[PDB]
């Protein structure tokens, strides 16, 4: 009994066929999306029909996922990484 989004994400991240567009960080708990554009084109449509990146992130935020902001303003803006507030 887990929310449809939670399952969609779990399924999406663990499916090896999406490895090039979305995957777990090396032995970690953060979700790496190497290129926003490619992810939206190749992966998103398989799990969400009426969706865009902004709505997806909004869903992620709801489940405690936040965008890692480690880039000193000085792959560029297409790289996204999410880490959850609930961690060890």
From Swiss-Prot:
Role according to the record: DNA-binding transcription factor that specifically binds heat shock promoter elements (HSE) and activates transcription.
Classification lineage: Eukaryota, Fungi, Dikarya, Ascomycota, Saccharomycotina
Modifications made to the protein after synthesis: Exhibits temperature-dependent phosphorylation.
Subcellular localization(s) per the UniProt record: Nucleus
Family: Belongs to the HSF family.
Quaternary structure (record): Homotrimer. Homotrimerization increases the affinity of HSF1 to DNA.
Shown chain mapped onto the complete sequence: 193 to 284 of 677
Identification of the protein by name: Heat shock transcription factor
Top-level division of the source organism's lineage: Eukaryota
DNA-binding region extent: 1-88
